[PDB]
């Protein structure tokens, strides 16, 4: 048994500071290689994370189930923990396809966590075989605000899971809201997946999605075409530099999707 | 057929029904002067009109409309002013 | 159908056709009023609506902004 792990599970920051001062180690791990820092992050217990880091907890330890403290913080949703770990050099890019921080945060709709992972150099387009891109999982789970954050950041609107594009996952889902969104960022409506099928063919007979994929089977407006082209010139999370252009404010906001 | 005239003097003759892709022109409608759109933009704008009309439902795959970055901003301003 | 730009001086005609040069010379007649290529006197691929074939030069685009560079 372990008082340090036990205190960290429940967010007992007083018990933790007590244990530390009596001489208990902070880098103690179980047989599964779980440290008290892992458990603190899992619970989103920011005070306990601070205390453990101050006393030299390791931020990149990997459990037997391939979880890192950063991964757990992404499960908890505590943006403060995620941020704090990123500051202390938590590795953004894991080794396991079973515990990808950016995907877990995306499937759970933890936008702010996603945002930070990208900011710290994470690959926004990381394509894991059996999951897809973070864009793809956010779509599958109908996480509207992750999708909009990912697209705005410069995520490739067409990379999903295998040959199945995000527009496909969205069609199965029947999300009219997410469909419009993907199309604003240039999703290909004419793409075929592993079954040869196109997105329109996966949407219920009774939906306006069918009319949406087909009424907009024509070409986008020239303004839409110019926007896609201009945004294509900026790197991930650089689109804000559109501010520095000599252009009417109305158009900067259009390019920024605001 | 209508005459669209750019800012540096070029005259563009296009089919009227094509030029009607611009709501802005549709309003003003046999000779339209454009004191702010330069020839290297207005030419692309006419090409877009042709592209738009031709592919406005041909049950085929619509191909990409090529846009060099160096003209994108002026072209966006034109597309905005022309509502297309 | 084949989509072409007919250019001569500071004027440009935007039209489309197929068959032969003969009637094409008269197409101009019924537009700019006159009697009926590269340095000389046309396919689905060489003249697309969005990329017309040319049959006085246009203005030169301004420099690319710095934020928009690689």
From Swiss-Prot, chain A:
Belongs to the ankyrin SOCS box (ASB) family. InterPro entries: Ankyrin-SOCS_box_domain, Ankyrin_rpt, Ankyrin_rpt-contain_sf, ASB9/11_SOCS, SOCS_box, SOCS_box-like_dom_sf. This is Ankyrin repeat and SOCS box protein 9. Predominantly expressed in testis, kidney, and liver. It comes from the Eukaryota. The keyword Repeat applies. GO terms for biological process: intracellular signal transduction; positive regulation of protein catabolic process; proteasome-mediated ubiquitin-dependent protein catabolic process; protein ubiquitination. The modification Phosphoserine is found at residue 15. Pathway: Protein modification; protein ubiquitination. GO terms for molecular function: ubiquitin-like ligase-substrate adaptor activity. The lineage of its organism: Eukaryota, Metazoa, Chordata, Craniata, Vertebrata.
Swiss-Prot record, chain B:
Belongs to the SKP1 family. The gene is ELOC. One of its GO terms (cellular component) is elongin complex. Ubiquitinated by the DCX(AMBRA1) complex, leading to its degradation by the proteasome. One of its GO terms (biological process) is transcription initiation at RNA polymerase II promoter. It comes from Homo sapiens (Human). It is found in: Nucleus. Heterotrimer of an A (ELOA, ELOA2 or ELOA3P), ELOB and ELOC subunit. The elongin BC complex interacts with EPOP; leading to recruit the elongin BC complex to Polycomb group (PcG) target genes, thereby restricting excessive activity of the PRC2/EED-EZH2 complex. SIII, also known as elongin, is a general transcription elongation factor that increases the RNA polymerase II transcription elongation past template-encoded arresting sites. Subunit A is transcriptionally active and its transcription activity is strongly enhanced by binding to the dimeric complex of the SIII regulatory subunits B and C (elongin BC complex). The keyword Glycosyltransferase does not apply. GO terms for molecular function: protein-macromolecule adaptor activity; transcription corepressor binding. The chain holds residues 18 to 112 of 112 of the full protein. Keywords: Host-virus interaction, Nucleus, Transcription, Transcription regulation, Ubl conjugation, Ubl conjugation pathway. Pathway: Protein modification; protein ubiquitination. This is Elongin-C. The keyword Glycosyltransferase does not apply.
From Swiss-Prot, chain C:
GO terms for biological process: positive regulation of proteasomal ubiquitin-dependent protein catabolic process; protein ubiquitination; protein-containing complex assembly; target-directed miRNA degradation; transcription elongation by RNA polymerase II; transcription initiation at RNA polymerase II promoter. SMART domains: UBQ. Heterotrimer of an A (ELOA, ELOA2 or ELOA3P), ELOB and ELOC subunit. The elongin BC complex interacts with EPOP; leading to recruit the elongin BC complex to Polycomb group (PcG) target genes, thereby restricting excessive activity of the PRC2/EED-EZH2 complex. Pathway: Protein modification; protein ubiquitination. Keywords: Acetylation, Host-virus interaction, Nucleus, Phosphoprotein, Transcription, Transcription regulation, Ubl conjugation pathway. It holds the Pfam family ubiquitin. The lineage of its organism: Eukaryota, Metazoa, Chordata, Craniata, Vertebrata. It is found in: Nucleus. InterPro entries: ELOB (IPR039049), Ubiquitin-like_dom (IPR000626), Ubiquitin-like_domsf (IPR029071). GO terms for molecular function: transcription corepressor binding; ubiquitin protein ligase binding. Belongs to the Elongin B family. It comes from the Eukaryota. One of its GO terms (cellular component) is elongin complex. This is Elongin-B. SIII, also known as elongin, is a general transcription elongation factor that increases the RNA polymerase II transcription elongation past template-encoded arresting sites. Subunit A is transcriptionally active and its transcription activity is strongly enhanced by binding to the dimeric complex of the SIII regulatory subunits B and C (elongin BC complex). The keyword RNA-binding does not apply. Residues 1-46 form the Ubiquitin-like domain.
């Amino acid at each position: 048994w372990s008082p340090m792990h036990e205190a960290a599970i429940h967010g007992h920051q007083l018990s933790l500071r007590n244990l530390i001062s009596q001489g208990w180690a902070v880098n103690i791990i179980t047989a599964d290689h779980v440290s008290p820092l892992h458990e603190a992050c899992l619970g989103g217990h920011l005070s306990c994370v601070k205390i453990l880091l101050k006393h030299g907890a390791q931020v990149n330890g990997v459990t037997a189930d391939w979880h890192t403290p950063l991964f757990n913080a992404c499960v908890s949703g505590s943006w403060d923990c995620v941020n704090l770990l990123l500051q202390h050099g938590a590795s953004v890019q894991p080794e396991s396809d079973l515990a990808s921080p950016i995907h877990e945060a995306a499937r759970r709709g933890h936008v702010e966590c996603v945002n930070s992972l990208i900011a710290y150099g994470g690959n926004i387009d990381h394509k894991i075989s059996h999951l897809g891109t973070p864009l793809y999982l956010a779509c599958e789970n109908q996480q509207r605000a992750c999708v909009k954050k990912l697209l705005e950041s410069g995520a490739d609107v067409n990379q999903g899971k295998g040959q199945d594009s995000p527009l496909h996952a969205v069609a199965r889902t029947a999300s009219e809201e997410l469909a419009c969104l993907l199309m604003d960022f240039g999703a290909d409506t004419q793409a075929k997946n592993a079954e040869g099928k196109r997105p329109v063919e996966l949407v219920p007979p009774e939906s306006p999605l069918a009319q949406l994929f087909l009424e907009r089977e024509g070409p986008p407006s020239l303004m839409q075409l110019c926007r896609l082209r201009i945004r294509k010139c900026f790197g991930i999370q650089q689109h804000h530099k559109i501010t520095k252009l000599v252009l009417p404010e109305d158009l900067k906001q259009f390019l920024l999707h605001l | 057929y209508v005459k669209l005239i750019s800012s540096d003097g070029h005259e563009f003759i296009v089919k009227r029904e094509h030029a009607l892709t611009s709501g802005t022109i549709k309003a003003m409608l046999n000779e339209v002067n454009f004191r702010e759109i330069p020839s290297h933009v207005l030419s692309k704008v006419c090409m877009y009109f042709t592209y738009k009309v031709r592919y406005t439902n041909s049950s085929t795959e619509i191909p990409e409309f090529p846009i060099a970055p160096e003209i994108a901003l002026e072209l966006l301003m034109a597309a905005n002013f022309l509502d297309c | 159908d084949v989509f072409l730009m007919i250019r001569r001086h500071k004027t440009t005609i935007f039209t489309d056709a197929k068959s032969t040069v003969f009637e094409l010379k008269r197409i101009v007649e019924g537009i700019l009023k006159r009697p009926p290529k590269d340095d000389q006197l046309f396919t689905s691929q060489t003249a697309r609506p969005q990329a017309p074939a040319t049959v006085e030069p246009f203005s030169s685009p301004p420099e690319l902004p710095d934020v928009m560079k690689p």
